[PDB]
Write a protein that binds this ligand. Structure first.
Ligand SMILES: [Cl-]
Ligand SMILES: [Cl-]
Ligand SMILES: [Cl-]
Ligand SMILES: [Cl-]
Lengths: 298, 301
């Protein structure tokens, strides 16, 4: 468990425009999420949650300034909308629904736009206006397997929004199936551990990670405890976090304890430059472990 | 004179939204302005000037994304417009008109909006939506003489746009007089050296810094060479630069050399967090000095 005494820096006041505001909202949202699930507010300071929640609501409200009439998001309203940023807003707001009031028309409008404007006939999600802060997208910044990585990223956002939006967005179940088809068709050709992990989570959420795909997912780990590529450590933390979430979806609780151990032994507590995806994902994944299998420990 | 070899950190790529983009635009605009006047492009490398102009045009074009329909500016289009930021864009664009193409409808639309929407019936300019980046407004930040300091700041911007805009904005001369009236009526009650300096320049531009007001302006200086809020180095560089511009308007060349010398002795070359106003003002003021006293004697530091 990441001790609350080491997480004070994650309580951040969001500011800036469409991208930077989300860079600021990210650590506060996910710190509250993780401190909640690990029952660490007595140590952190019980009275401090109210203020954190006010900062999350400020982040949410400020983000609406960058909601374009299409319901998509960009750094500023005169900039063409970003597929990735819109999917990231969906990912954050969906997780934050039990913390603050999230307008379902914002969330589901963003989902519908992604599907109707940015999914292609083969199921891929396409980015036409990349975020300026490329450091906020984690391992997706790498040029290789970008189609697969982004399609998995967006698909994960649709899945995390499905319960809220499935009655409001006609196109949602078919979009999920199409994206799933694309990932499944190309999974065995993947070479990056990062893509194996993020696409693995997306497929496992649909019950479509099995057979030789599931074997590729599991055997891609090094020392059965991490998904790693030659490159930035932060990308490996992010990848292993997506893999932990896929293991939990799979209920592979035997495999989980070494992965959790490796994540704790990285002594990574979020925050800093280029930390957005690693921070969201490591605390999302460890919170989900605490919720689902804290009894499985090394 | 600030040596061109010391200035290359002022050529920067502007980025971000309506406030940050101007934080980036400021050093490069004023660096080119200063290098032009002091004819230092040899030491710097004359091949570099075209690239700097392209960086200025990029800042200009990017800034237009944050021009709201009213012609006012804020950090983002859905934010309530800022009186200060709109006046600062007018200030920067007015000085950049000789470097790149500045659309006069953009510039004078902002001027007209300031007068029609943000000047009160007693001539004060009011800020209803302060900038998020309070570090970019210099010594106006936490300045308790708020109406005097902001009215002086906006008036100064109106004056630097007057030649371009008075033909398109027929309310500009009256707005200038009313702002000046407000400053002159309350100048003697000022206490902050910063406000004395910036309102001093605004009045001097109009020929209305005289008599006891002129005496207060001059005797507020310390050691006859600076306008000082103790411990506030960047504020003081900015304020003393406004004071130098005021002295040059007064043509008080007996007073000017020690002020120029103090500014040079700070070994301050702009740039860095919170440096926007100090950077714009010191290079504006020292360029005007070079322009007004072109054959002054070499500074022996
Ligand atoms: Cl941004
Ligand atoms: Cl609470
Ligand atoms: Cl905007
Ligand atoms: Cl900004």
């Amino acid at each position: 468990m990441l001790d609350a005494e080491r997480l004070k820096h994650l309580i951040v006041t969001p500011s800036g425009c469409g991208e930077q505001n989300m860079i600021g909202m990210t650590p506060t949202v996910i710190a509250v999420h993780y401190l909640d699930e690990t029952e660490q507010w007595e140590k952190f300071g019980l009275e401090k949650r109210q203020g954190a929640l006010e900062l999350i609501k400020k982040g949410y409200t400020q983000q609406l300034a960058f909601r374009q009439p299409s319901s998509a998001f960009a750094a500023f309203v005169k900039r063409a909308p970003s597929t990735w940023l819109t999917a990231y807003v969906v990912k954050v707001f969906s997780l934050a629904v039990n913390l603050i009031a999230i307008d379902s028309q914002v969330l589901c409008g963003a989902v519908k736009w992604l599907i109707l404007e940015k999914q292609k006939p083969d199921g891929v999600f396409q980015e036409d206006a990349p975020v300026i802060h490329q450091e906020m997208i984690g391992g997706l910044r790498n040029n290789n397997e970008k189609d697969m990585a982004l399609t998995a990223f967006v698909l994960i956002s649709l899945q995390e929004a499905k319960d809220i939006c499935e009655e409001q967005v006609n196109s949602l179940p078919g979009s999920i199936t199409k994206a799933g088809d694309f990932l499944e068709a190309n999974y065995m050709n993947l070479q990056r551990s990062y893509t194996v992990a993020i696409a693995g989570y997306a497929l496992a959420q649909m019950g479509r990670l099995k057979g030789p795909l599931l074997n590729k997912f599991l055997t891609t780990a090094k020392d059965k405890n991490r998904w790693e590529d030659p490159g930035k450590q932060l990308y490996n933390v992010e990848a292993t976090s997506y893999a932990l979430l896929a293991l939990l979806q799979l209920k592979d609780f035997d495999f989980v304890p070494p992965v959790v151990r490796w994540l704790n032994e990285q002594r990574y507590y979020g925050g800093g430059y280029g930390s957005t995806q690693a921070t969201f994902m490591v605390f999302q994944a460890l919170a989900q472990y605490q919720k689902d299998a804290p009894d499985h420990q090394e």
